[PDB]
């Protein structure tokens, strides 16, 4: 009864692939989702009336962006200053920050002009910071205390740059509404929840592919679209494919990077922050000399660059939204809500110079790195890798027996929701063209 | 190329089944063993020259016993008093122990005569102890202190009875020598080590059975002989069979018992025990009133009835051999060698009344309950179950697609090495008869 297609993952890529096939008259389609939910790294949570994003937060502008189009078409779509604080409870003056910002931006451009691959982009940052460090050290007119603060702001910027990897729209109702739109069309029977896959068996001798589920169910199939993260692949490629993947694809899985980026929300009964403060930015004065990329686990909290104040209060309450990227996010994920809440409260006391700040009423946080269905937040082309690795990863296996979809497999829109969606449509489109060729040949 | 037979487990049952098939001209035979070793619950360890059994220790006499025959044919086969000590470092006099022993044996026989199923055997113990407790309490001539000791000896006996479940020969070279004899004949390629099975798939549409390995290898087969313990079945039957087992067999798996019985060996530099002492038997004076079947985890050590002195010293060194049965053995298995060694040393100080006993030089111990390939030491017909459950467990699935072997599936020799061996030959014999019928019919 037609070709049997199995999609692994009910994130944007898996749902987009499933929908595209169903719309082109593929009846025998089943989505195997590991978790109890759809959307994957799109995860919207409601604390009372308020809606908080634990994954994807922003749509990256654009009319061509098919997630903007989805949202706008269904009508889902829609202050003050960054307060820089020192670890001895002092605010850094406007003029110091503004002076640093301009020095950094001037030196970043003189560097970026001098250089556009992965190793190029990274080295702009590295040589910018060392030149900025020189210009501060060698400035004859700045006093000692001011130089120590500005040098520590290099380390604060470095932490902000560590989370960065791509004008910007939010969905106040929840990013999960966009996910629910894609899934509307899909019949109920198609999406199997709580159904993690253990291994894909290909080059077999009615069904040349067998999907081995964790619950030991064997599902024969003609084609499999794999949408699991680069994190899942890195951890499981050795056991997840029989026979082994082509060595080019194994190399791609090794060379491409995936970052753990977790969100920390702190709900307070009353606010303790000035009405001029959009954010609290944490500058540790003892980090003037350090070039620290990864902190030891005891100092995981130091990788938090600061906290944004959510606006408006009536929508969200009095909530601080922090980000933590890298191995320090994995350490954070191992700690209890009380242990995390306590350390963030301690930090905010030290940085505000106000020892009477109460522990937050509630705490909400993501755990993407430790989750065996994600093992990270988003992909990037790493200091070593290229766009060739993304093409290698995306490349189907012989017979289109296994196709590779997901954000990581998208050449220009990797680490985005639209990248995921479009990577799904690409692989669905690949099958459609293959079965058009059989129609045209015969 | 002939019928494809897969044996799960390279214990006595699996090896016996494999050998029997190979000897009757079954060429296409493979044994999948989870662990890196053969023998299963036969496990011999050498500390220097000495050989210590962590599993099966004794051959239960007999000429008909095929393990006696195996040993004797290859020439592998071959003091003092039990010292009863109180928890206040006092030895219980010969006459007190002898008086208790006779009271127990007299009252056990008067009860056993009055009653022979599982619920019958257990109830003999229960009504014996309560009658003994009465006869002690109501004895007009015994003093108070003596009654408290004798009543606490009921609890010490109760612990010894908790490990009991079946004249007696040892193999000084190692019980593993008997295992190695069976395996001699078996070609190298047949036994796959480090190869745990995850699920057996039966009622399929060239190979009506698929064995799903933990490493995700799918092995087509005509017949599967399952030799894993009742412990493994109890824990994994829900996931280990597709489709589900007959409800009669599920009920049998539930109703039949498997006990965790672990061995503790303590090697001392010098002995601290009298040359008259074969064993140190631990009587806790505060257990006069208790009828405790299972201790809380904090008091796991109380389930140790005492320690045997191994003889002769030149063979073994100065070693104490203790046994611990039940949930208290699972608690023991979670503790470190230092933590276990320390508590046993503390006990021996309290019970000898000698506070200067050094911590043992070495410690050796089994961990059958926590081991996912055993989850217990041996089967028994439980207070509720019958020999009908053993027949239900032993019963093959339709087509002899799956056969059930192992100690637990043997009607009279369950919980023994010969039971395991003979249960293997039974299932091998079952296949041989099935393929003799096809030879005679056609
Ligand atoms: C002043 C000032 C400061 C402000 N600075 C401005 C800078 C802002 C720059 N933007 C940042 C954006 C972030 C951080 N954004 C962000 C933040 C965070 C915290 C995250 C986690 C992500 C993001 N991204 C990336 C996307 O979320 C991601 O690419 C896609 O959802 C993935 O889709 P998929 O490929 O289908 O995989 P999926 O994993 O979703 O689905 C696969 C499924 O497979 C399942 N699975 C796994 N194993 C399985 C198995 N064995 N068997 C069966 N199933 C299995 C699994 O359960 C899943 O359901 C963002 N994207 C975007 O558009 N906007 C954004 O803001 C962000
Ligand atoms: C004065 C005074 C005091 C003295 N008192 C005297 C009283 C003495 C009474 N006797 C007591 C005897 C004991 C306690 N004895 C004793 C003590 C102790 C500590 C133990 C642990 C046992 C015993 N017994 C029982 C036997 O050891 C047991 O029945 C068989 O070896 C099991 O064989 P099998 O069926 O093949 O299973 P196996 O489990 O061996 O093999 C199955 C294989 O399957 C493998 N497997 C599991 N899962 C798998 C998967 N998923 N995939 C693939 N493979 C997988 C696994 O790794 C194994 O290798 C004894 N027997 C005996 O004859 N003499 C004895 O003394 C004792
Ligand atoms: Cl199945
Ligand atoms: Cl990482
Ligand atoms: Cl395979
Ligand atoms: Cl138990």
UniProtKB/Swiss-Prot annotation, chains A, B:
Name this protein carries in UniProt: Spermine oxidase
Organism: Homo sapiens (Human)
Gene, per the UniProt record: SMOX
Record's cofactor remark: Binds 1 FAD per subunit.
Record keyword Nucleus present: yes
Pathway involvement of the protein, from the record: Amine and polyamine degradation; spermine degradation
Cofactor(s) demanded: FAD
Tissue specificity statement from the Swiss-Prot or TrEMBL entry: Widely expressed. Expressed in human tumor cell lines. Isoform 4 is only found in an embryonal kidney cell line.
Variation of activity with pH: Optimum pH is 9.5 with spermine as substrate.
Taxonomy of the source species: Eukaryota, Metazoa, Chordata, Craniata, Vertebrata
């Amino acid at each position: 009864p037609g070709p049997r297609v199995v999609v692994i993952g009910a994130g944007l890529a898996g749902l987009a692939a499933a929908k595209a096939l169903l719309e082109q008259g593929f009846t025998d389609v089943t989505v195997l989702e590991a978790s109890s939910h759809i959307g994957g790294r799109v995860q919207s949570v409601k604390l009372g009336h308020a809606t908080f994003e634990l994954g994807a937060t922003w749509i990256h502008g654009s009319h061509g962006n098919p997630i903007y189009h989805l949202a706008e078409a269904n009508g889902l779509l829609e202050n003050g200053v960054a307060c820089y604080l020192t670890n001895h409870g002092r605010r850094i003056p406007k003029d110091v920050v503004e002076e640093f910002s301009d020095l950094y931006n001037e030196v970043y451009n003189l560097t970026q002009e001098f250089f556009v691959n992965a190793e190029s982009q990274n080295s702009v940052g590295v040589f910018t910071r060392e030149e900025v460090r020189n210009r501060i050290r060698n400035d004859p007119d700045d006093p000692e205390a001011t130089k120590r603060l500005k040098l520590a702001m290099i380390q604060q910027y470095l932490k902000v740059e560590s989370c960065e990897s791509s004008a910007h729209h939010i969905i106040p109702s929840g990013f999960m509404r966009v996910v629910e739109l894609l899934a509307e069309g899909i019949p109920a029977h198609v999406i199997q929840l709580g159904k993690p896959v253990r291994c894909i068996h290909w080059d077999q001798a009615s069904g040349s592919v067998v999907v081995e589920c964790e619950d030991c169910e064997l599902i024969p199939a003609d084609h499999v679209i794999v949408t699991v993260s680069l994190g899942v692949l890195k951890r499981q490629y050795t056991s997840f494919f029989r026979p082994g993947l082509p060595t080019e694809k194994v190399a791609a899985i090794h060379r491409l990077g995936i970052g753990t980026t977790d969100k920390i929300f702190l709900e307070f009964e009353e606010p303790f922050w000035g009405p001029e403060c959009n954010s609290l930015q944490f500058v540790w004065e003892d980090e003037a000399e350090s070039h620290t990329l990864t902190y030891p686990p005891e100092l995981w909290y130091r990788k938090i660059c600061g906290f944004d104040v959510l606006y408006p209060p009536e929508r969200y309450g009095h909530v601080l939204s922090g980000w933590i990227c890298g191995e320090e996010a994995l350490v954070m994920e191992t700690l209890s809500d009380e242990a995390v809440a306590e350390i963030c409260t301690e930090m905010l006391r030290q940085f505000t110079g106000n020892p009477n700040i109460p522990k937050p009423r509630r705490i909400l946080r993501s755990a993407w790195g430790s989750n065996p269905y994600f093992r990270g937040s988003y992909s990037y082309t790493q200091v070593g890798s290229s766009g060739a690795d993304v093409e290698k990863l995306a490349k189907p296996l012989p017979g289109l027996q296994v196709l590779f979809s997901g954000e990581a497999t998208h050449r220009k829109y990797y680490s985005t929701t639209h990248g995921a969606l479009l990577s799904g449509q690409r692989e669905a489109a690949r099958l459609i063209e293959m079965y058009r060729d059989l129609f045209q040949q015969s």
